[PDB]
Amino acid sequence: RDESVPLPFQTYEQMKDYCEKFKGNPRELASKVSQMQSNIKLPIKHYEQNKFRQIRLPKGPMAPYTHKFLMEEAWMFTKISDPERSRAGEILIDFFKKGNLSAIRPKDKPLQGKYPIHYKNLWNQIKAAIADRTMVINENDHSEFLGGRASKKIPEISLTQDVITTEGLKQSENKLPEPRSFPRWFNAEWMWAIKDSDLTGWVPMAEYPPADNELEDYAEHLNKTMEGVLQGTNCAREMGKCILTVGALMTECRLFPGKIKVVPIYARSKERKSMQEGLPVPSEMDCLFGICVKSKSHDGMYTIITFEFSIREPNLEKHQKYTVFEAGHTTVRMKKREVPLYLYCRTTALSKIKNDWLSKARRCFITTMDTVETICLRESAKAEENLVEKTLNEKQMWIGKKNGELIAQPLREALRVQLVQQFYFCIYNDSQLEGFCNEQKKILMALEGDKKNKSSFGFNPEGLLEKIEECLINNPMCLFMAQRLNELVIEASKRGAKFFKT
Amino acid sequence: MSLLLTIAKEYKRLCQDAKAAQMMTVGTVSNYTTFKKWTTSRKEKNPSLRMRWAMSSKFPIIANKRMLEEAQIPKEHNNVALWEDTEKRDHVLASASCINYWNFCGPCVNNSEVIKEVYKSRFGRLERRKEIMWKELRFTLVDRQRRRVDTQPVEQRLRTGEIKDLQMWTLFEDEAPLASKFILDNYGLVKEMRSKFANKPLNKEVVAHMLEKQFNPESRFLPVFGAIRPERMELIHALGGETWIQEANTAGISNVDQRKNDIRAVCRKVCLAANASIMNAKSKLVEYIKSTSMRIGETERKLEELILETDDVSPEVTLCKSALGGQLGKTLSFGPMLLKKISGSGVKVKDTVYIQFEYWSEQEEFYGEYKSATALFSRKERSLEWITIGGGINEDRKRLLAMCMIFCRDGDYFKDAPATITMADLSTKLGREIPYQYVMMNWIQKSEDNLEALLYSRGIVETNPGKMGSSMGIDGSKRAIKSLRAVTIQSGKIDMPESKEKIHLELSDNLEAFDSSGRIVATILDLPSDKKVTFQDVSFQHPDLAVLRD
Amino acid sequence: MEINPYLMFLNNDVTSLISTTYPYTGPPPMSHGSSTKYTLETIKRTYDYSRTSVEKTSKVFNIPRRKFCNCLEDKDELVKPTGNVDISSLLGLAEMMEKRMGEGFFKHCVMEAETEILKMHFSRLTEGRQTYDWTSERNMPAATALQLTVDAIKETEGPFKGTTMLEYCNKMIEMLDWKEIKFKKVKTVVVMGIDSIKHDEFLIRALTINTMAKDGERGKLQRRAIATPGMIVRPFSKIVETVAQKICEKLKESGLPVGGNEKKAKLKTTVTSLNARMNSDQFAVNITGDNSKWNECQQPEAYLALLAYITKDSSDLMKDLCSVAPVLFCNKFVKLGQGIRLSNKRKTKEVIIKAEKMGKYKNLMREEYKNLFEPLEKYIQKDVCFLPGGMLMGMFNMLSTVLGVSTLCYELKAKGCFWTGLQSSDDFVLFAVASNWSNIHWTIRRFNAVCKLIGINMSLEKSYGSLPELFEFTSMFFDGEFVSNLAMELPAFTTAGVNEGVDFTAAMSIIKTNMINNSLSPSTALMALRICLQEFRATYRVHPWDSRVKGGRMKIINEFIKTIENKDGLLIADGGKLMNNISTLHIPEEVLKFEKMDEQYRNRVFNPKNPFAVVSTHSFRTRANRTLLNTDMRAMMAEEKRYQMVCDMFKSVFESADINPPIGAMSIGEAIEEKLLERAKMKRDIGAIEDSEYEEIKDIIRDAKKARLES
């Protein structure tokens, strides 16, 4: 205590006295003015720094496909499910293999492939396993495949001599991630997830509760309609496969730890037919995207090996992590032609945390819902009328740009946008993204500050933009949103000018 | 029979272990409260994940072996294993599905009546919902953001310590302290509860835990929309929020809500009794309190334990409590109005001015509560510095304005002299001169033109554009043609402050409580209701009310 | 065509749709690598921010202590964060705070504190976050750590009979003078034992604080780690924390001891208050203020002085108990972390290094590491770094906010000289009023001057301001409207995890509470229900009776269905469909289904003689993982189990033990014996039990009394 004291006084008692017998004079006015002169604190104005140097963006290789699964290019394999056969969910593929799947085999010579032979062998090991049992009977191949590695350890005690006698070239270094540039494919991915798929619904939603006239009629109606719109979308498809498959793995970690297992990449959907004819039924089924392999390692992050079918030609710029093969030819048809099949392969890391949060993807619906619903109430609450139904169809939301012209869609279809946006937020979540948004909010607030002419100000915009820049590394979404905020700032500057355009 | 034996043998075993033996001997029993706290059941890092992980395996759950052995088959109907002999605890493991099976095919009868009255709380909160009508519309609602209002109200609600006493007595007798205060006075509820729950030994811990909740109004800080009855509170969410509204609700309420008001009237009369004789106000009122006996809808209960421990603090109730040792601060009463203090401070000073007077010179900012109307005021140097009204009905706004002006006490206070010297001046109560604020107060409460007088005493100006919505008319409208000075209305309600505080001090000889070394909280006589109507109410000891024949 | 979501922000107001900027739907960040980098970097930031070259060698540590208050080695970069606290002006804020609100403000607040604490049983100290157990030198849940601490005191010098926070504290201070201390330390031989330690080692171990690589933090790329202090430090911390809590509550401008739905209106009130306060000439404007390195700047040295000022009048018996809490942070030791690794350009060999042996490797590390490391060798110790001035984060949030309010509390008589607002820990909202637009600059400037005067550093990059209408506080954005966002309460919605009935009903009441406070719309909550339901059905592997889905649990339901008439009224757990709604949220599923239930069903499910807002038909314990038991942690737990069986035993004897905290001036065993005798007599005299059996029980009792006495 007696040497913990701050003041020139050393004995506690003296500090005690100055405290107890304290009466402060008005010298803090002059102390504050001198503090101010020394401060040179920045009295900032918004009109002056309104430019914000637009937004800084990184230059290098185009960012890759960080999502554990491929969406747009991914290919499906339909199967009409049995309640008792499918129930296993692990037998789904076993029953699939009796179909055409067994036929498909890739050539040794692959397009854009990083470790061909390994992946080819493994594919064979999967196919062989499926016949007997969905487990890979490997003790040694497992270790390598995990590696594609361990580092043998050395005691400090014995190490002192090898410092004195430097051998094995002793050193210490850490590494950083390489920055990437704004993706192009992302826009196309969003445009594909937005549009409705032919299959009707993917995310398993429960029944509806009994209704009283007053409130329940409203809630029940709104939900049935919104679910109706969003279940048809491809975004929902990917939500489904995510939930079902990550669920399947989450079971497999308890079922067979320290074991190698073959898990399918599937999603369940029922087809809906409204031709106005009495059809046999709306089609009830489950479709497959590809096969997946578990490897328990490290508690900690699991190592996973994804294999997806596709009908589309691979793009080196975005599929860099992916290793492509030429698999064969698959039939596609319609009536009011078989296209070659490519097999995309990769490896990735799954934290148990990521397994959990990605498994519960349904959450995204909710954050859309609120966001949507609020708009309808706030609007209708003005006219004190039921304007929900009217507002959904009439109220126009700015969705995109085409031919240099600002486009807008009704709230019901621009709903898909928010949903996709929330789904991506789920998938593409990196500490980068977190920092991005949590600093981006300041931008948005300054923006609306300018909208309603509130004459804002930001103290060190260079510093803010520096933190924004800092959190932008190699995150497709993060960067995408950056570039889209640029275009925002632009069009906004054009409407009312308290911003810059280069 | 061996049930008591094996326990003894266990004790033998434990006290043989010297380590456990010494910790069992040293110190009080209170150590158990600490000892139990040295065991968390398990790690709680990843809740939802842990559970999803848990149920994934087929046989994880811990379960009770003996009872299942006694009543039902351990084997399955579809030949999937259900039971083993493998184990440290006496509880043997089993699958999840079995539980569902006994629910289906288990042999059991006649438990229905036993259940409900155990959770009369929850079950009643259901019952109430049946009896109501419905309607639907939308609006940009302005809700009342902060009311510390009782939710989940139940008859005979009480404090935590006392309810703990009840808990003990009803659950068991074998280990209960002979607690006097609650048992002697509130017996009868003791009878009822103890009778229904002691006889049929089931769920000993659970019931206790739910009775604790059964008499505990959850007085949270919540946003309401005008319906301030503790019954609509429980299910506000379905009734509204900022853009929702529902209808036909006031009707079905528990018998409590009106009973509290009855107790307010009780306190009214009991205070009029002490008012009547000013030889002493301290030694007499206390008598009228402890003597009087209340009769609740299903119980006889003393007036003391109701007053001391009532949630709602009315101007009367304040006075009633003041006699006893009941700390209920944060409450300020002035006539019919209720107030809260939020800013600064200053001293009581004496100032004689031509119509002695007590004036405060604080730059103090306070909150105004009146029927259907809320507001914010700030006074500095005996005059209102800042003012804003968030009322609903025009009249009640005007009333607010007035009352707060009285408490404010400007120079114009003195200027208005119609009568007063004749009647209002001296109060006909053993020749007692009544305080001056309350004098002008009563003068305004007298007639309709008396309100108009001081309403005009304030500066009146044609308000400027930009104050069209804010400006207050004399009649209480938002027209802004002509309006009062140092005042602006607010399109919407005004939030109410809250403080977790307890303060108490003795009262003066004229029903005044100078609590917190001043502050004049007691307001003398709030309302001069000269009426004497009572129902199922007890009184005693020369009550000065004649109900006693020879 | 080019899809841009942000384009919708054009026409609409941002505050309403701000919930879509935050990506709360996904998972949070996670720690990778060594936490030693951040630690060291931060200590350097502490000392650097502490703008003072004044250094005095400590009499007890032989280590240079840098004590830095008043003494200011100003740097040109004044705007850059400072940590130097002018104690004189601080106590000025203290006085002009008190005289602002009462004259015995501190005296009384302290009174309340003294009261609550003097009452307090030290067992309540187990309530709290994880703290540093110094016996095993690891982090633990407070309870188990305290168990070891006390148990050690017992094995060293005899059992502890304090039963109070005071006597606990008195024993704490008594142990510093102890030259020798004994521990329950586990040593395996190819078992638990009794290790020794000296005063010199022990002192350091006491002042020691441990590093936690951050998890659960929302919204940052880099990891701002959290510190978790020692068990001997915690009580005194709780004392100050409660004092400050008392102070906090009373402040209108305080946003800390009051939160959630309350905070909201605190703002609305002070808003309309200020709007009324305005003159026709005067002009109001707001700023959203965020602070960076809030904890690093503040100094326990300054807190010691402030605490001495508050306790000036209250008592000389508790003043000395207030001053103790800071000095343990004025002399605090910081554990460094996991360490650094060595690698060759071979990816073959790796050499792990302890924190202790960094000084061995010296120039071997990269130049950055060297540059951060070399200065810290002054203050370094064998495992730990010593630092006075920095305040560790999270410990004194209360007292921190106190200081903040002290800044906003009020000054120089100037035209339009107004500022006030709210503050929670680091975060602060500032409303400034001045006659003319130019003066506002000067007034705000004066405010940051006074803040930075005592170590409050507004983040020049993060903060921003405007007309009064727009501002943000702790994820709560304002306008005419009032921050509709559910982003805050997203992961709580999912299954809580105790048991099925408890899970669902809790989930419901949550949806409710969220619907009222957070103000989410109803159809949202309906979806929220249907979701929580689906994920409930999944998490417990159950599905509707009409569901085609076949499973183990479902298979039974295939025979179940035909029997029950009212298949809707069935509980969800047994495969019942949804009956609850938005209207019936307050109502637990059991009740709502109860009336409609089948008689056989209801009686068979809720029967108390079973192998089984909180509903009671299914309640079960989740088996602990086989992870903590395999390690030496079980060898330690051998003591905790000895507590268990006793607690279980007494509860078997006294039924209400858990419900009513047992009292009376008796030993546990004595009460146990006499109560057993009473129950034996009861059962004998009138009930159905033999006499010789009663005598056999009496014999067991007395025989037990012998073994009890011998100890």
Q: Angle at CA C516, nearest 5°, toward C511 and C517?
A: 100
Which residue, among B122, B330, B342, B380, would best test binding to C if mutated, counting the most C CBs under 10 Å from its CB?
B122
What is the spatial distance between Cα B315 and Cα C357, in angstroms, rounded to a whole number? 73
Residue A142: partners with Cβ closer than 8 Å, 6 or more residues away: A136, A260, A295
Closest CA to C503 of C582, C596, C573: C573
Domain limits, chain A = 76-148+234-359, 183-231+363-495
Distance of CA C637 to the CA centre of its chain: 25
C555 close to B78: Cβ distance less than 8 angstroms: yes
Q: Residue C176 to residues A162, A451, C149, C161, C198: CA-CA distances in angstroms? A: 42, 63, 14, 19, 10
B/e letters for A169-206, b = 16+ CB within 10 Å, e = fewer, are ebebeeeeeeebebbebbbebbebbbebbebbbbbebb
* Residue C211: φ, ψ to 5°: -90, 135
DSSP 3-state of A235: helix
Q: Angle at CA B254, nearest 5°, toward B253 and B256?
A: 120
The helix or strand, by DSSP H or E, that contains position B70, with its residue range, turns out to be helix B65-71
What is the spatial distance between Cα A451 and Cα A472, in angstroms, rounded to a whole number? 27
Q: Is residue C573 less than 8 Å (CB to CB) from chain B? A: yes
Question: With the CA atoms of A390, A392, A396 and A400 taken in that order, what torsion angle do they form, in degrees rounded to the nearest 10?
Answer: -160
Contacts of A351 in chain B (CB under 8 A): none
Contacts of B56 in chain A (CB under 8 A): 250-251, 254-255
What is the spatial distance between Cα C219 and Cα C290, in angstroms, rounded to a whole number? 14
Contacts of A212 in chain B (CB under 8 A): 134
**Helices A415-427/A185-194 angle, 10° precision:** 120
A493 close to A501: Cβ distance less than 8 angstroms: yes
C303 close to C396: Cβ distance less than 8 angstroms: yes
Pairwise CB contact (< 8 Å): B49 & A385: no
Closest CA to A173 of C36, C360, C369: C369
Strands B332-334 vs B337-341: parallel, antiparallel or unpaired: antiparallel
Pairwise CB contact (< 8 Å): A31 & C27: no
A357 token code pair: 């949060």
Length of chain A: 502
DSSP 3-state of A330: strand
Strands A302-310 vs A260-270: parallel, antiparallel or unpaired: unpaired
Strands C208-212 vs C332-335: parallel, antiparallel or unpaired: parallel
Closest CA to B116 of B233, B217, B197: B197
Q: Which residues pair with residue A306 across a beta bridge?
A: A292, A346
The helix or strand, by DSSP H or E, that contains position C270, with its residue range, turns out to be helix C261-277
Contacts of A222 in chain B (CB under 8 A): none
* Residue B140: φ, ψ to 5°: -75, 80
Q: Angle at CA B134, nearest 5°, toward B132 and B140?
A: 125
Which residue, among A174, A407, A493, would best test binding to C if mutated, counting the most C CBs under 10 Å from its CB?
A174
Residue B119 gets which letter from DSSP?
G
What is the spatial distance between Cα C92 and Cα A28, in angstroms, rounded to a whole number? 8
C648 close to C641: Cβ distance less than 8 angstroms: no
Q: Angle at CA B482, nearest 5°, toward B476 and B488?
A: 60
Pairwise CB contact (< 8 Å): C5 & A484: yes
Q: Which chains touch A (3 or more CB pairs under 8 A)?
A: B, C
Strand order, beta sheet including C464-466: A457-458, C464-466, C283-289, C427-434, C418-424
Shortest CA distance from A251: residue in chain C: C539
Q: Is residue C480 less than 8 Å (CB to CB) from chain A? A: no
Contacts of C126 in chain B (CB under 8 A): 37-38
Pairwise CB contact (< 8 Å): B56 & A380: no
A270 close to A283: Cβ distance less than 8 angstroms: yes
C214 token code pair: 């951050």
DSSP 3-state of A254: helix
DSSP 3-state of B171: helix
The residue ranges of DSSP E strands in A352-460, in sequence order, are 396-402, 405-410, 457-458
Closest CA to C329 of C199, C456, C234: C234
Shortest CA distance from A256: residue in chain B: B57
Query: DSSP readout, A348-377?
Result: EEE-HHHHHHHH-TTHHHHHHHHHHHHHHH
Residue B294 gets which letter from DSSP?
E
Query: DSSP readout, C44-105?
Result: HHHHHHS-----EE-TTTSSEE---BS-----S--SS----B-HHHHHHHHHHHHTTS-SSH
Pairwise CB contact (< 8 Å): A381 & B140: yes
One-letter amino acid at A98 equals K
C119 close to C126: Cβ distance less than 8 angstroms: no
Shortest CA distance from B238: residue in chain A: A215
C322 close to C111: Cβ distance less than 8 angstroms: no
Q: Is residue C584 less than 8 Å (CB to CB) from chain B? A: yes
What is the spatial distance between Cα C448 and Cα C290, in angstroms, rounded to a whole number? 12
Pairwise CB contact (< 8 Å): A444 & C18: yes
What is the spatial distance between Cα C264 and Cα C256, in angstroms, rounded to a whole number? 12
What is the spatial distance between Cα C433 and Cα C468, in angstroms, rounded to a whole number? 10
Contacts of C601 in chain B (CB under 8 A): 103
Pairwise CB contact (< 8 Å): B134 & A382: no
What is the spatial distance between Cα B371 and Cα B369, in angstroms, rounded to a whole number? 7
What number of helices (H) and strands (E) belong to chain C? 24, 19
Q: Which chains touch B (3 or more CB pairs under 8 A)?
A: A, C
C248 close to C402: Cβ distance less than 8 angstroms: yes
Length of chain B: 550
Contacts of C528 in chain A (CB under 8 A): 366
Query: DSSP readout, C469-514?
Result: T--EETTEEBSSSB----GGGTGGGS---S-HHHHHHHHHHHHHHH
Closest CA to C544 of C586, C577, C582: C577
| Greatest CA separation for chain A | 97
Find residues 692-711 of chain C whose CB sits inside 8 Å of chain B: 693, 696-697, 700-701, 703-704, 707-708, 710-711
From the list C516, C582, C586, the residue facing B222 with the nearest CB is: C516
Pairwise CB contact (< 8 Å): C703 & B41: no
What is the spatial distance between Cα B105 and Cα C585, in angstroms, rounded to a whole number? 30
What is the spatial distance between Cα C414 and Cα B147, in angstroms, rounded to a whole number? 39
Q: Residue B446 to residues B336, B371, B441, B531, C86: CA-CA distances in angstroms? A: 14, 19, 9, 18, 60
One-letter amino acid at C710 equals E
Contacts of C141 in chain B (CB under 8 A): 40
Closest CA to B393 of B450, B476, B333: B476
Residue B263: partners with Cβ closer than 8 Å, 6 or more residues away: B294, B306, B307, B310, B317
Q: Angle at CA C234, nearest 5°, toward C229 and C235?
A: 175
Pairwise CB contact (< 8 Å): A36 & C449: yes
Pairwise CB contact (< 8 Å): B138 & A215: no
What is the spatial distance between Cα C206 and Cα C527, in angstroms, rounded to a whole number? 52
Q: Residue A494 to residues A30, A398, A406, A491: CA-CA distances in angstroms? A: 47, 15, 12, 5
* Residue C674: φ, ψ to 5°: -60, -40
Q: Which residues pair with residue C424 across a beta bridge?
A: C427
Q: Angle at CA C710, nearest 5°, toward C707 and C711?
A: 95
B345 close to B359: Cβ distance less than 8 angstroms: no
Q: Residue A43 to residues C79, C430, C437: CA-CA distances in angstroms? A: 12, 15, 12
Could you tell me the sign of the dihedral formed by the alpha carbons of B535, B538, B544, B546, in that order?
A: positive
One-letter amino acid at B441 equals M
**Helices C165-177/C199-207 angle, 10° precision:** 140
What is the spatial distance between Cα A209 and Cα C522, in angstroms, rounded to a whole number? 14
Shortest CA distance from C515: residue in chain B: B237
Shortest CA distance from A385: residue in chain B: B138
DSSP 3-state of B375: strand
Residue B272: partners with Cβ closer than 8 Å, 6 or more residues away: none
Question: With the CA atoms of B130, B136, B140 and B146 taken in that order, what torsion angle do they form, in degrees rounded to the nearest 10?
Answer: -10
Percentages helix, strand, coil for chain B, rounded to the nearest 5? 40, 15, 50
Q: Angle at CA A389, nearest 5°, toward A383 and A393?
A: 105
C144 token code pair: 């188990």
B/e letters for B121-157, b = 16+ CB within 10 Å, e = fewer, are bbbbbbebbeebeeeeebbeeebbbbbbbbbbbbebb
Query: DSSP readout, C149-191?
Result: HHHHHHHHH------SHHHHHHHHHHHHH-SEEEEEEE-----
Contacts of B203 in chain C (CB under 8 A): 608, 616
Closest CA to A226 of A361, A388, A384: A388
Residue A455 gets which letter from DSSP?
-
Q: Angle at CA C564, nearest 5°, toward C561 and C565?
A: 115
Long-range contacts of B435-444 (CB under 8 A, 24+ apart): B435/B358, B435/B524, B436/B357, B436/B358, B437/B358, B437/B406, B437/B407, B437/B409, B438/B335, B438/B523, B438/B524, B438/B525, B440/B406, B440/B413, B440/B416, B441/B335, B441/B403, B441/B406, B443/B416, B443/B418, B443/B419, B444/B402, B444/B406
Closest CA to A80 of A270, A361, A256, A242: A270
Q: Angle at CA A420, nearest 5°, toward A417 and A426?
A: 145
Pairwise CB contact (< 8 Å): A381 & B243: yes
B74 token code pair: 């351990």
Length of chain C: 711
For tokens 């690598």, what's the residue? C33
Strands B293-296 vs C384-387: parallel, antiparallel or unpaired: unpaired
Residue C562 gets which letter from DSSP?
H
Pairwise CB contact (< 8 Å): B39 & C611: no
What is the spatial distance between Cα C647 and Cα C660, in angstroms, rounded to a whole number? 14
Tell me the CB-side half-sphere exposure of residue C81, using CA atoms within 13 A. 21
Q: Where are the alpha helices (DSSP H) in C311-436?
A: 319-330, 358-361, 367-376, 397-408
Find residues 386-425 of chain C whose CB sits inside 8 Å of chain B: none
Residue A209: partners with Cβ closer than 8 Å, 6 or more residues away: A216, A220, C526, C529, C578, C579, C580, C581
Contacts of A377 in chain C (CB under 8 A): 521
Q: Which residues pair with residue B378 across a beta bridge?
A: B365, B386
What is the spatial distance between Cα A307 and Cα A301, in angstroms, rounded to a whole number? 19
Query: DSSP readout, A27-81?
Result: THHHHHHHHHHHH------HHHHTTTTS-----SSBP---SSS--TTB--EEE--
A404 close to A459: Cβ distance less than 8 angstroms: no
Residue B355: partners with Cβ closer than 8 Å, 6 or more residues away: B414, B417, B420, B421
One-letter amino acid at C92 equals G
C389 token code pair: 């001035």
What is the spatial distance between Cα B264 and Cα B307, in angstroms, rounded to a whole number? 9
Long-range contacts of A135-139 (CB under 8 A, 24+ apart): A135/A256, A135/A259, A135/A260, A135/A261, A135/A262, A136/A260, A136/A261, A136/A262, A136/A293, A138/A260
**Residues before each break in chain B (C–N > 2.5 Å)?**
87, 355
What is the spatial distance between Cα C207 and Cα C63, in angstroms, rounded to a whole number? 15
Strands B358-360 vs B364-370: parallel, antiparallel or unpaired: unpaired
Stated in angstroms to one decimal place, the resolution of this structure is 3.9
Shortest CA distance from B5: residue in chain C: C697
What number of helices (H) and strands (E) belong to chain B? 22, 17
Pairwise CB contact (< 8 Å): A206 & C30: no
Question: With the CA atoms of A434, A439, A441 and A442 taken in that order, what torsion angle do they form, in degrees rounded to the nearest 10?
Answer: 170
Pairwise CB contact (< 8 Å): C272 & B490: yes
What is the spatial distance between Cα B285 and Cα B292, in angstroms, rounded to a whole number? 11
Residue A161 gets which letter from DSSP?
H
What is the spatial distance between Cα C301 and Cα B207, in angstroms, rounded to a whole number? 52
Bin C329: left if φ > 0, else alpha if -120 < ψ < 50, else beta. alpha
Pairwise CB contact (< 8 Å): B222 & C618: no
A152 token code pair: 């043998």
A244 close to A69: Cβ distance less than 8 angstroms: no
Shortest CA distance from C526: residue in chain A: A219
Contacts of A353 in chain B (CB under 8 A): 49
Shortest CA distance from B225: residue in chain C: C516
Contacts of C529 in chain A (CB under 8 A): 209
C222 token code pair: 């880099």
C431 close to C421: Cβ distance less than 8 angstroms: yes
Residue B377 gets which letter from DSSP?
E
| Greatest CA separation for chain C | 99
One-letter amino acid at C458 equals M
Q: Which residues pair with residue B377 across a beta bridge?
A: B366, B387
Which residue, among B43, B46, B49, B134, would best test binding to A if mutated, counting the most A CBs under 10 Å from its CB?
B49
Pairwise CB contact (< 8 Å): B345 & C101: yes
* Residue C594: φ, ψ to 5°: -55, -50
Residue C225: how many other CB atoms lie within 10 Å: 17
What is the spatial distance between Cα C562 and Cα C574, in angstroms, rounded to a whole number? 14
One-letter amino acid at A133 equals R
Size of interface B-C (CB pairs under 8 A): 374
Pairwise CB contact (< 8 Å): C584 & B129: yes
Q: Angle at CA B186, nearest 5°, toward B182 and B191?
A: 110
